[PDB]
Structure 1
Amino acid sequence: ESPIGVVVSSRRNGPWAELTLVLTPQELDQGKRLLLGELVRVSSGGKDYVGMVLDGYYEPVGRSDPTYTLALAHINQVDLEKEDPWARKEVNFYHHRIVLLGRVVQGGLFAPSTRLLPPVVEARVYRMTEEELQRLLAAYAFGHLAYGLEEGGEYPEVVKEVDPALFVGRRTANFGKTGFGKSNENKVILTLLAHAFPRVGMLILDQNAEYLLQTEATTSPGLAQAFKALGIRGRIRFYTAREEAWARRLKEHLGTEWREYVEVLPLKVDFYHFPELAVALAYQRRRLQGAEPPQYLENAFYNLEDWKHIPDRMAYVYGALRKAGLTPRKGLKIKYKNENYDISEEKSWGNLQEAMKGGARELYSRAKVFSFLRAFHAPGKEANFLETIKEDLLGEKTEGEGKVVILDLPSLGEAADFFTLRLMDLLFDRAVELYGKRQANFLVVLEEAHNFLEDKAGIFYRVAKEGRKYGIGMLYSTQSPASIPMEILSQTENFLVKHLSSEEDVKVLKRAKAPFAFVADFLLSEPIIGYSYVYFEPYQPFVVPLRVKLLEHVLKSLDS
């Protein structure tokens, strides 16, 4: 608890105050040192600040010629630590430069920067203790403070914890290069949240088939295996179009009791049970396209409910669906005119077609518009996966149950984009409707975010803009800050940045967040796997390096 060095200068460098530090030969010989990027405490006028070590250089002190002295000593071949202490004692100095980030006030709130410049004579620098660092971070470990790979610059007892107040309701960003720990960090956060706070729902837009089962030695285990290890039962809902294959995999990996941990559902519905759903999907498809859906489609969409009571109109609609290509189950009857056909058979279908209005006839004539729906049709399902997901996430019965929803987007094929957009729009509309009665209280995991947050009119863009009001969070990973719009980057509240190689990425990051200007050099120069620079608002508005943990070790530690 003694000052490390002596302050010998200070100034207002741009928007940040700074001051220079000097390490005397006695301290240098004792073994004291300062690591670049280290956090130190600065005392000035009875107020403690938080400073970061920025730069270090060697500069002569007093009237001396270090070059000549050292060169002459080397020439004469005199050991400089045992023969000439009086010559080694006048060249062993070293300078440091420190920047004041701000001071903590009241209930942990961070007062930024400072308008007051401290005089040299009365400014001291003390090394920060573990208790002080723990207080700084705090006001189920996610990662412990570490300064690079330097031994002695790691503090396993200083950790950052997971709290729904940090994630739910706020947007998080997760950058980094390919293969550095973004997915591992996402899974760590999700597992810790699902184990600590079971009233937080999730929606994982899986795009690589990695968040449920993962066995290959190229990524951390899957959420299913993590839940099995941690003993979390009946909380995962899997939506996929490969029910049998995924059941085989779950049986072969999770064991014979896999049905407790994972519940598998299909992404197929029978449209002969939800003609309104079919018409709504067809109408929404074009609106998500350019614009201006046709008048006949608008009329059908608005008036199918009234049409439901007229068997002739409904027969026209069912005929249109059958003509589009969708296969009905065995034994279907259609009441046209005064007759009951069986469209499941060739002759009955032909007779009905030969036999065949307020708007149904135009739909029947233009039946090719429903062809795309064959990517979802499966006779005998009657599920309405969209509605089921809506109840799973925003259901009124929950009031806190915990529900992890994973969608196997790859199984769909070329309909995944449209399906995702439609589902997100439905969920956001329901959440807006529910405002004032209950909060959604769930998180939207999004990977490869640059595909979704491009257009300003997108539903994902609107969600990113307006989700905090209704309690809808977000957590997106993109591998490159340059691919996200500045409009979103500025408004993002949390950051988790891994190694970045391109100068454009670091420039964009520092442009979006000013405090990220002090770590650009570290990011550019150090390709370390699992090293993260976290920045959380508003309690911790400064960059703190961390050492993210492996999912296997997190599981093994949480078991006890």
Structure 2
Amino acid sequence: KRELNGYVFISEDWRLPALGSSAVPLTSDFLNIIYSIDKEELPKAVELGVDSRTKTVKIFASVDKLLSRHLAVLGSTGYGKSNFNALLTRKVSEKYPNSRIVIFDINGEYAQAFTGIPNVKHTILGESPNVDSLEKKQQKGELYSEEYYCYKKIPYQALGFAGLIKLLRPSDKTQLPALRNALSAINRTHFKSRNIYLEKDDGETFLLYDDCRDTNQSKLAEWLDLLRRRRLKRTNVWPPFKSLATLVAEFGCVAADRSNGSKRDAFGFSNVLPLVKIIQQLAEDIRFKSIVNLNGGGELADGGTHWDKAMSDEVDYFFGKEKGQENDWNVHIVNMKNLAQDHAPMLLSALLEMFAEILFRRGQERSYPTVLLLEEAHHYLRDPYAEIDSQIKAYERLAKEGRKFKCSLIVSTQRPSELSPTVLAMCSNWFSLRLTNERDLQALRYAMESGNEQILKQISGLPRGDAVAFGSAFNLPVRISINQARPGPKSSDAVFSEEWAN
């Protein structure tokens, strides 16, 4: 029908025509009204493609509706799922150059696609193969070109009083209280070349050992009760990841002879030994140590505030700075090329908890919008050795805190059956490419809201490039043909013939 001097489309199905009325075909002037958006939203739109059957009508969507909430991208291998995300993320920037986009790239593909755009960054997770090599910083307003990048490790201070307990799993009698007493006292131990000790308020010192040697075993009690009730001297440097193993033993191999004077007994020491074994094992390794920095260094400003500032500083590196402050980059790409399938959940399901905690504090006055892109999320969104839903408590918190405090999520994947059905219910829009199996095409049925069956019964036969869209940003569903990105992502994984021919 007409509104003022144009037309408008309304979806409601109870009307019908009268007998004798004449039937007429539709044109590219009415199709462009059936598949269009409002006028209120037109100056905030983004182009995605063209309609498949006819190919005379272009498709637009509104940034607000599309991204104020969470979004899902699904599809099998080799059908066009990585072109879509680069198209979208680059077209958001080219239109709103004051944006904030963060990308978790676990394959190293999404850097070749942002060549030619300002305020880009590129960080790799690990150590440099070479050592005496340089890395070149860039300035503001400079167009991104490859051959600029940086490296990074993650310290161990930024895992808290709880991450370490979870990572070590004290599963028997007398490991827990000792491992608590050690973490509570780690801020009063001093360090030298290769030995650990304490320093009293007045010069005197006393050594600690890790083998239960009886030398000077008579003053423990009174050199330990003080450390236990906050009486010894403090320090200002973070020690390494082995003072922990050195304290867990001298807190578990102590007793008292009925003859006054303490003794570092041998029986109790065995009740704690295995924790010492494993906490030693996690230093002579090539995987954990390549990513994490278990060496010890930095400031430890007093005030009982030495666990929080590490989190607060590690969050501002990946996710961004508070409002008002000056943040250099606007696009951040994180590369996890070198990261094992074993330490992925533990590490990548803690930065998100950090972000949740900090975003609860910043509030609505100090928080800045950001888009966060998560690739192959069926690898780290469910802690495998967390076999009860009592332990999946990260997405369920971050989604709500973000919906409240301006953080948007994009979830991309190719196996929606290895993914809980409450992750796929907090979404308000859906993009799906061809799915080949029949058990990954029921997990979507079971969990969708705003579709039907005639748009789902034509997903098994979608060609390469074509998709199907529905949700709260589309008036009626559409089958759509996506347009190619220039430049796109990389795909150089491996090819045999070449090497065999060399």
Task: Compute the TM-score of the two structures, normalised by the length of structure 1.
Answer: 0.58
Q: CA deviation at 1:266?
A: 1.1
Determine the structure 2 residue equivalent to 1:183: 82
Number of the residue aligned with 1:363: 248
Q: 1:476 aligns with which of 399, 402, 411?
A: 411
**Alignment partner of 1:226 out of 113, 116, 122:** 113
Q: Which has the higher helix share?
A: 1
Deviations 1:54-90 (A, max 9, x none): xxxxxxxxxxxxxxxxxxxxxxxxxxxxxxxxxxxxx
Partners of 1:113 and 1:554 lie apart in 2 by 41
Equivalent of 1:431 in 359, 367, 370: 359
**1:250-265 paired onto structure 2 within 5 Å:** 262-265=148-151
Deviation at residue 284 of structure 1 after TM alignment: 4.8
Residue 177 (structure 1) shift: 1.5
1:535 aligns with 2:474: no
* Residue 152 of structure 2 corresponds to residue 266 of structure 1: yes
Partner of 1:391, secondary structure, is: helix
Alignment of 1:315-464 (within 5 A): 315=190, 336=199, 338=203, 357=224, 358-359=227-228, 363-365=248-250, 367-368=276-277, 370-371=279-280, 372=282, 375=289, 376-377=292-293, 379=295, 382=298, 387-392=312-317, 393-396=319-322, 397-398=324-325, 403-413=330-340, 414-454=342-382, 456=389, 457-464=392-399
Kept in 2: contact 1:243–1:266 (CA 8 A)? no
Question: Partner letter of residue 480 of structure 1?
Answer: R
Task: Give me the whole-angstrom Cα distance separating, in 1, the residues matched to 2:170 and 2:88.
Answer: 33
Q: Distance in 2 between matches of 1:242 and 1:133?
A: 54
- For residues 343-380 of structure 1, give each alpha carbon's deviation from its aligned partner in whole angstroms, at most 9, with x where no partner exists: 9xxxx999x99668255985354645644476312547
Q: Output aligned runs, 1:1-12, within 5 Å.
A: none
Bigger drift between 191-200 and 242-251 goes to 242-251
Task: Count residues with an aligned counterpart.
Answer: 399
Alpha-carbon distance between aligned partners in 2 of 1:147 and 1:109, rounded to the nearest angstrom: 23
Q: Which residue of 1 aligns with 2:58?
A: 158
Shift of residue 340, structure 1, vs aligned partner:
7.4
Label 1:399 to 1:432 Cα distance change in 2 as closer, same or farther (>3 A).
farther
- Residue number in structure 1 paired with 2:28: 129
CA 1:531–1:314 in structure 2 vs 1: closer, same or farther (change >3 Å)? same
Task: Name which one, 1 or 2, has greater alpha-carbon Rg.
Answer: 1
CA contact (8 A) 1:447 1:477 kept: yes
Equivalent pair of 1:238/1:408 in contact (CA under 8 Å): yes
Question: 3-state DSSP class of the match of 1:542?
Answer: coil
Structure 1 runs not aligned, ≥5 long: 1-46, 49-103, 212-222, 252-256, 319-327, 556-560
Give matches, 1:87-102, under 5 Å. Answer: none
Q: 1:144 to 1:280 in 2, by over 3 A?
A: same
Query: 2:48 & 2:332 partners in 1: Cα distance?
Result: 26
Question: Which stretches of structure 1, 4 residues or more, deviate above 6 A after TM superposition?
Answer: 107-110, 245-251, 257-261, 287-290, 330-333, 340-343
Q: Which runs of 5+ in 2 are unaligned?
A: 39-44, 137-142, 229-243, 251-274, 300-308, 383-387, 490-502
Does the 8 Å contact 1:452/1:458 carry over to 2? no
Aligned to 2:123: 238
1:515 pairs with 2:451: yes
**Could you say what secondary structure the match of 1:395 adopts?**
coil
Query: Judging changes above 3 Å, is the alpha-carbon distance between structure 1 residues 362 and 267 closer, same or farther for their aligned structure 2 residues?
Result: closer
Which residues of 2 match residues 251-330 of structure 1 at below 5 A? 262-269=148-155, 274=157, 281-285=163-167, 294-301=176-183, 303-304=184-185, 308=187, 313-315=188-190
CA displacement at 1:474 relative to structure 2: 1.1
Task: Give 1:427 deviation, angstroms.
Answer: 0.6
SS in 2 for 1:436: coil
Deviation at 1:426, TM superposition (A): 0.5
Task: Tell me by how many angstroms 1:535 deviates.
Answer: 2.2
Counting aligned pairs with the same residue, the percent is 18
1:191, CA displacement in angstroms? 1.7
User: Whose strand fraction is larger, Structure 1's or Structure 2's?
Assistant: 1
1:509 is paired with a residue of what secondary structure? helix
Secondary structure in 1 aligned to 2:428? coil
TM-score scaled by length of structure 2: 0.64
Deviation at 1:175, TM superposition (A): 0.9
Summarize deviations over 1:151-182 as a string: whole Å, max 9, x none.
xx213x61335725522x31111111111111
Residues 428/531 of structure 1: CA separation in 2 closer, same or farther (3 Å cut): same
Counterpart residue type for residue 227 of structure 1 = F
